[PDB]
Amino acid sequence: KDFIINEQIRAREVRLIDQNGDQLGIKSKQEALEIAARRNLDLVLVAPNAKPPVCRIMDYGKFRFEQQKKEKEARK
Numbered sequence: 001k002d003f004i005i006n007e008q009i010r011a012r013e014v015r016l017i018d019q020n021g022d023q024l025g026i027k028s029k030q031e032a033l034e035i036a037a038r039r040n041l042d043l044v045l046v047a048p049n050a051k052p053p054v055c056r057i058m059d060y061g062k063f064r065f066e067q068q069k070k071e072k073e074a075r076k
């Protein structure tokens with residue numbers, strides 16, 4: 001569920017996938033953070049144990065809200 005995002009990420013390099021599924025390739029964490037920032041989105045570590053770790057560009061708050069919404073609705 002919970003993913004670490006943005007500056008919480010410690011990986012030197014990550015494989016980057018953008019908000020639409022475009023495979024941006026291997027990028028330094030710094031460049032990945034720049035791309036996320038220019039798009040006003042978050043850099044989310046979706047696959048911490050992949051080699052190299054996989055990050056997805058997305059709005060973390062919107063993603064998390066929808067996930068919690070889904071869980072709650074299906075149980076009431």
Ligand code: PBM
Pocket residue numbers: 030031034
């Ligand atoms: C990967 Pb830079 C500090 C424009």
Ligand SMILES: [Cl-]
Pocket residue numbers: none
């Ligand atoms: Cl640079």
Ligand SMILES: [Cl-]
Pocket residue numbers: 040041042
């Ligand atoms: Cl943000």
